[PDB]
Design an enzyme around this catalytic site. Structure first.
Site: not given
Ligand SMILES: [Mg+2]
Ligand SMILES: [Mg+2]
Ligand SMILES: [Zn+2]
Length: 1434
Positions: A89, A115, A1007, A51
């Site tokens: 924080d 997160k 296709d 932190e």
């Molecule tokens: Mg924190």
């Molecule tokens: Mg075709």
RNA sequence: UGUGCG
């Protein structure tokens, strides 16, 4: 067990940073004795370390007290209303700017994605809530994939983490204080391929999964032998034949009748078109007068820079500097432009810049002269009466106005001088500010027309006709008008006859006359435009969308040459010699129409012509083809377009015309592919979203399974319904029932699924080639909570698989798009990889395999060469109708240690995909809510509208729809390809069992191309009834296997089509219009050299596909014109516009740049080529390799070249040859658009997860909610290049005009402009050291030429270093346009020298262009080849 | 944060 404990304690006590914030945590950590609290304090300290490092690295104040935003703002003295509970924080303030720095660590990609998204949404909510507080808030999210930080070094941190994990294991085995879910989460978040990820998830599959498996096994026999399968197929075929002969089953195919098909195409819109054979002259007459734009394009609009333009440009420039109030500055500027206009009128009787009683001011504004003078009088009088109240001095209104003008000009000059631009470079004359200035403005009167915009369609100023369709005048006018319309989007926001005093305007010149595009609304939105002229106002009025008029801006010559080549395709057809002008006219008209009125309906109408012409030249076609080719048409020009297309078709496909059918087929196919000229972007986003949701929802409603708003945990009713619908999907009957087979209904038959699986199992389909506690864990910055732990049949414990539904826009409409989470994407990728590998084990699938596509192309060519039967099949509703339960049942019934476990995991994942939840777009829900409210408050009542209304009348609002009958479009694409492969192999096996022939199939998702052997072709020619019965049986079998053959599928011997590639006998079929439109539509806001490289790639593939080289050169010139409009200097390293076939076939981009440079300076390149040849011979033997890359490529340039020339015994370049230079605006830093190879390596390495994951994720989430247009890209490019994009050596930002002005100050440097606009500079060698301001921006041309030539010689060979002798006039040859020739391109120690060249030459990406696919087949023109240059080693 | 029709 304690020695490492003491070791770790000593390690942390010694190597911890002595930060005041860490002291409390360190004291808590060291004092610990019990293992549990020691573990807690270690986790605490780690959280605080990351932190704090995040807070310090980004420059923010750490939140140790974890106060809420309310507490922070109140403690800092700022009051805010009630907010949601958000505790960052890190947080910091500067001025009024608040930055929050919430931080997290996630070692997993899915957890990191979740997160980051949650954090970003939380901060977005907080910012929207605080916007009322008048306080800025820019969020920053710091998510790292590792625990490494600047507070603790790497190795001790790793030892600490390992010891903490071992301590956790010890505590869990001893104390078991952590919950097993929480223990697993913490262990996962502490320990720092995908199929084994299901091993760690608890198996929680209950009886629902067992019931689903039993359902996919009930009634199915996969153990049938080949004999029994063959007998069942034969019995099914005999019953089908008997019922088809008796009429109980209707035939879905008809033999092609050319006259009948033409008649069906003629009566396609016979409800309002009261004619069938329109006169061509009358069609031209109608077309030239159809629309106001079309009226303006073909009318008789016919008739030295002045000071008004100079002053307008200068005042436009100084307004961005905000000299400062806005309204006042605007008024002051208006007066200056008016003075300049009056000066021009009294000097040379000019008339430009005026629209009657209004003049053209700054910011693209029309300003009324009367309003200008009244406002000026009021403002001057107010200031005079205010100021004279203090002292007694002569006011002298003229002097007051002059003084204000001088003050404004002085401030503007001071502002411009900072960025390096002087006023004399705008050529403004100060004589326009006369001493008699106030009275001159107030005594100014004009007489003229009144500008008007007619919003409604309640007469034309000129003669509506006169401009011939043959000439290019119409295309030039459309180009100018398109440029004006696009530029109308650049105006900044300022504040029936609708004549107005002030509006916005754009200027364009046509035939020497000035026209003004007038509008009253700003932005990139549809609005009303009016073309006006000074002579007569309000030439026309329309309601165009500005961002749909890009492809015509500078494409007049390109489009004209496209039409000319198309017409030359059919020129030797004898029956079309008399009707050759009309055809030409028609072609032109169609193009012009689709460029003046770009409509989605017109796009689809032009697209359907491809299917019409494919069925025309075929043998059998679906009976429902005509109904599919018809579209609802609204606007009158759309019906005009249909009539023009019908006339062109009836001339080209006449019964009297039978001479050269391949050319006419190619011409009609190109006319059809002209639909790519219209932009593929959505006209209305909401309408397209509604259409997408209807396409998604109607099949589920028809089937009868729609779960409305299902929860993450499934209710017993929903699971029971899912089981019931799984049983219903396999309960499809056919050919052995009273009511018979029901076509196009989704589902598979038990009998036919059994036959498919049994044939696969016995090998019939194969070939010879095969056999406190919780609170603190939440508080941790690295603890992961997003990891799933258990899985059920409905999905993971974290919730069922969510998919947001949207549309990907393309030509002919949109395709549905499903977007999931990262975790869902990985879960799906497991299935996709399995099924891709499983298909790779087999052959015939061309979806992802590239060599298989080439094999299919060769087989198609060989089939067409022998005139065998080819069946080109599209599958309708491949996505919506086909079901993941179908894949689950097929996989459960197929037979191929760990294989059983892999199959179990695959079955679980497919069961997850069965229970997927698709989120209804919120725009659609809101539109339905508004419609419901307006209908219930204030007759069609569509099925979707009925659905929403029925849900609305009962409370709940639909948000998610869960249904068995859906696979994501592109989600289960490899699985769908595998199913198509095996199902078509079984179908071909059954057909071969029934008849005597074999079918070679090359499927690819939806296709498919089926090549019929000789026996089937003979059967068709001699036994049409049996061949038709076989075709119907193939259709019936495909329907029984949930493959619904589209009505656009065709059987025939003329053309084979696959993945938008067409092949016929003898001639080639290039999609010239498709490639030209693609080139005209790809201009972005990237750096100009990147745009040049992209255009070069596009032109390279267009040349390889058959477009003639002159049209491609014209396209390159169009790109250079687009760049020149942005006033970006054209260096010799952007594009080459005098290329030939050998430049694109033998050479590459570097070779083309060499050719351009050699064209620029012929005589200065011969000696360089001689020295390069000597150098190549020296390094071929191996010498001079090591003493050249380090002694010369790192030395100063323009000085080592003479050293090389003297070292190799050749004459060094003379005094003037070194003076050639090009201006590099990225000399110091790349241009602001918002060693090169070293940076590229850095970006690639820091891209995936370990580094740059947060950066790339931030850019992805920023660019997700930002979508733009091609025209918006062009205007953004113009704005960016006109802004301060040039970065100087010291991080300064400058204009390009600043650099040009600094160059123009020096008189020694001279510019030289090529015939195509390429500019190169001659810098006298007497000055490269005195005034280094802009000499650092120049680069010698010879050095870049040498580096590029050497790199090209290394990659391609010595032939590029030979002398380029031009072609020699042989004699006289035919110029047959459809005379093609296939061609193949000419394909460790030198890698180091290459990468050394690239870091030395900051001109082009040399060694990085290998991986960004070289074309391995070229189809060029023989006439163009025989005029190419010669370059041979000698 | 453009004023630029090759
Ligand atoms: Mg924190
Ligand atoms: Mg075709
Ligand atoms: Zn003039």
């Amino acid at each position: 067990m304690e020695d490492d404990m003491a070791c770790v304690k000593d390690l942390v006590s010694k190597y911890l940073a002595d930060n005041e914030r860490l002291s409390r945590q360190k004291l808590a950590f060291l004092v610990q004795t019990e293992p549990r609290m020691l573990l807690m304090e270690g986790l605490k300290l780690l959280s605080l370390c990351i932190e704090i490092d995040s807070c310090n690295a980004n420059g923010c104040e750490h939140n140790s007290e974890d106060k809420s935003v309310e507490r922070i703002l109140h403690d800092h003295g700022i009051l805010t209303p009630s907010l949601c509970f958000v505790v960052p924080d890190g947080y910091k303030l500067t001025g009024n700017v608040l930055i929050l720095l919430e931080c997290f660590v996630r070692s997993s990609p899915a957890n990191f994605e979740q997160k980051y998204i949650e954090d970003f949404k939380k901060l977005e909510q907080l910012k929207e809530d605080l916007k009322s507080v008048d306080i800025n808030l820019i969020p920053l999210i710091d998510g790292r994939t590792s625990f490494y930080n600047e507070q603790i070094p790497d190795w001790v941190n790793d030892k600490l983490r390992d010891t903490l994990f071992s301590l956790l294991r010890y505590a869990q085995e001893s104390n078991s204080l952590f919950e097993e879910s929480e223990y697993s989460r913490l262990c996962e978040s502490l320990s720092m391929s995908g199929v084994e990820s299901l091993n760690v998830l608890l198996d929680n599959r209950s009886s629902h999964y067992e019931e689903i498996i039993a359902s996919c096994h009930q009634g199915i026999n996969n153990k049938l032998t080949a004999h029994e399968v063959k007998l069942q197929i034969e019995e099914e075929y005999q019953v089908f034949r008997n019922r088809l002969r008796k009429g109980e089953i209707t035939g879905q195919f008809l033999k092609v009748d050319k006259s009948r098909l033409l008649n069906d195409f003629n009566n396609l819109y016979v409800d309002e078109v009261t004619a069938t054979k329109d006169n061509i002259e009358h069609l031209i007459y109608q077309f030239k007068r159809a629309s106001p734009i079309l009226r303006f394009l073909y009318a008789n609009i016919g008739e030295k820079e002045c000071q008004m333009q100079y002053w307008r440009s200068f005042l436009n420039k100084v307004k961005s500097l905000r000299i400062l109030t806005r309204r006042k500055l605007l008024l002051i500027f208006d007066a200056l432009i008016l003075l300049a206009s009056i000066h021009d009128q009294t000097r040379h009787k000019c008339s430009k810049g005026w629209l009657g009683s209004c003049f053209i001011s700054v910011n693209d504004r029309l300003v009324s002269l009367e309003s200008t003078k009244r406002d000026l009088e009021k403002w001057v009088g107010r200031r005079q009466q205010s100021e004279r109240s203090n002292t007694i001095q002569p006011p002298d209104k003229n002097q007051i106005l002059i003084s204000m003008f001088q003050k404004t000009i002085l401030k503007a000059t001071a502002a411009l001088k900072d960025v390096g631009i002087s006023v004399e470079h705008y050529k403004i004359n100060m004589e326009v500010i006369c001493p008699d200035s106030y009275d001159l403005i107030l005594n100014f009167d004009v007489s003229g027309v009144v500008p008007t915009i007619s919003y409604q369609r309640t007469k034309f100023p000129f003669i509506m006709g006169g401009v011939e369709l043959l000439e290019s005048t119409d295309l030039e006018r459309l180009s100018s008008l398109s440029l004006a319309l696009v530029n109308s989007m650049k105006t900044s926001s300022t504040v029936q006859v609708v004549r107005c005093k002030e509006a916005y305007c754009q200027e364009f010149l046509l035939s020497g006359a000035e026209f003004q595009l007038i509008y009253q609304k700003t932005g990139e939105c549809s609005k009303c435009y009016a073309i006006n002229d000074n002579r007569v106002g309000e030439i026309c009025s329309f309601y165009a969308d500005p961002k749909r008029y890009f492809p015509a801006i500078f494409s007049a010559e390109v489009l004209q040459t496209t039409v000319s080549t198309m017409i030359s395709w059919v020129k030797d057809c004898s029956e079309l010699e008399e009707q050759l002008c009309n055809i030409n006219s028609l072609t032109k008209m169609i193009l012009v129409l689709i460029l003046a009125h770009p409509s989605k309906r017109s796009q689809k109408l032009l697209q359907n012509l491809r299917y019409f012409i494919m069925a025309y030249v075929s043998d059998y076609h679906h009976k429902d083809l005509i109904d599919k080719l018809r579209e609802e048409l609204i606007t009158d020009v759309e019906f005009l377009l249909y009539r023009l297309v019908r006339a062109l078709v009836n001339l080209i496909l006449s019964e009297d015309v039978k001479s050269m059918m391949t050319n006419r087929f190619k011409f009609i196919l190109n006319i059809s592919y002209m639909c790519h000229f219209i932009t593929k972007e959505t006209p209305d986003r909401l309408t397209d979203q509604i259409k997408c949701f209807e396409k998604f929802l109607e099949p589920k409603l028809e089937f009868g399974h729609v779960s409305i708003n299902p929860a993450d945990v499934a209710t017993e009713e929903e699971l029971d319904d899912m089981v019931y619908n799984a049983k219903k999907f396999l309960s499809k009957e056919g050919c052995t029932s009273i009511k018979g087979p029901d076509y196009k209904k989704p589902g598979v038959s038990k009998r036919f699924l059994s036959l498919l699986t049994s044939s696969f199992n016995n090998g019939s389909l194969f070939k010879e080639s095969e056999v406190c506690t919780t609170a603190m864990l939440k508080n941790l910055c690295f603890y992961s909570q997003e990891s799933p732990q258990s899985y059920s049949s409905t999905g993971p414990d974290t919730g069922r698989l969510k998919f947001s539904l949207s549309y990907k826009e393309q030509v002919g409409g949109n395709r549905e798009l499903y977007i999931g989470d990262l975790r869902t994407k990985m879960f799906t990728r497991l299935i996709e990889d399995y099924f891709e590998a499983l298909s790779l084990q087999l052959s015939g699938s061309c979806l992802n395999n590239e060599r298989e596509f080439e094999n299919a192309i060769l087989s198609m060519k060989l089939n067409v060469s022998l005139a065998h039967v080819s069946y080109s099949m599209d599958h309708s509703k491949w996505g919506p109708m086909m079901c993941p339960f179908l894949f689950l049942a097929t996989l459960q019934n197929l037979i191929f240690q760990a294989d059983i476990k892999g199959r179990d995991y695959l079955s679980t994942l497919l069961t997850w995909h069965m229970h997927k939840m698709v989120e209804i777009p919120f725009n659609v829900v809101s539109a339905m809510m508004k419609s419901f409210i307006k209908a219930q408050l204030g007759t069609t009542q569509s099925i979707t509208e009925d659905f929403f209304y029925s849900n609305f009348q009962i409370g709940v609002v639909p948000s998610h729809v869960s249904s068995i009958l859906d696979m994501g479009q592109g989600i289960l694409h490899n699985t769908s390809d595998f199913y198509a492969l095996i199902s078509e192999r079984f179908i071909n096996y059954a057909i071969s069992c029934i008849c005597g022939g074999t079918i070679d199939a090359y499927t690819s998702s939806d296709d498919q191309i089926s090549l019929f052997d000789q026996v089937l072709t003979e059967l068709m020619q001699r036994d049409p009834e049996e061949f038709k019965t076989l075709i119907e049986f193939h259709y019936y079998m495909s329907d029984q296997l949930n493959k619904f053959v589209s009505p656009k599928s065709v059987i025939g011997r003329f053309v084979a089509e696959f993945k938008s590639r067409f092949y016929v006998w003898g001639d080639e079929v290039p999609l010239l219009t498709k490639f030209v439109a693609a080139a005209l539509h790809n201009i972005k806001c990237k750096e100009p050299h990147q745009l040049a490289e992209t255009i070069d790639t596009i032109i390279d593939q267009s040349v390889a596909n058959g477009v003639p080289v002159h049209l491609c050169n014209l396209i390159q010139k169009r790109t250079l014109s687009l760049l020149q409009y942005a006033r970006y200097p054209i260096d010799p390293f952007l594009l080459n516009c005098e290329t030939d076939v050998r430049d694109w076939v033998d050479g590459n981009r570097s070779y083309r740049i060499m050719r351009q440079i050699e064209r620029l300076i012929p005589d200065a390149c011969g000696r360089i080529r001689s020295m390069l040849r000597k150098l190549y011979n020296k390094l071929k033997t191996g010498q001079l390799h090591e003493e050249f890359t380090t002694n010369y490529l790192s030395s100063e340039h323009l000085s080592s070249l003479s050293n090389l020339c003297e070292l190799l015994g050749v004459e060094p370049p003379s005094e003037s040859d070194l003076e050639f230079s090009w201006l590099n605006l990225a000399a110091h830093h790349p241009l602001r658009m918002v060693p090169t190879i070293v940076k590229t390596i850095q970006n690639k390495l820091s891209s995936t997860f370990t580094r740059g994951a947060q950066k790339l994720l931030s850019e992805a989430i920023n660019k997700s909610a930002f979508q733009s247009s091609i025209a918006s890209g062009f205007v953004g490019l113009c704005r960016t290049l006109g802004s301060k994009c040039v970065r100087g050596p010291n991080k300064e930002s400058l204009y390009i005009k600043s650099i040009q002005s600094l160059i123009s100050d020096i008189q020694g440097i001279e510019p030289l402009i090529d015939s195509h606009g390429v500019q190169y500079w001659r810098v006298p060698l007497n000055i490269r050291d005195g005034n280094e301001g802009v000499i650092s921006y120049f680069r010698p041309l010879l050095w870049d030429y040498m580096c590029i030539s050497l790199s090209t010689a290394i990659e391609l060979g010595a032939w590029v270093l030979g002398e380029p002798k031009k072609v020699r006039v042989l004699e006289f040859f035919k110029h047959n346009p459809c005379d093609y020739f296939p061609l193949k391109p000419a394909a460790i120690k030198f890698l180091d020298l290459c990468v050394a060249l690239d870091v030395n030459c900051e001109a082009l990406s040399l060694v990085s262009h290998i991986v960004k696919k070289r074309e391995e087949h070229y189809i060029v023109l023989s006439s163009e080849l025989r005029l190419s240059h010669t370059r041979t080693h000698e």
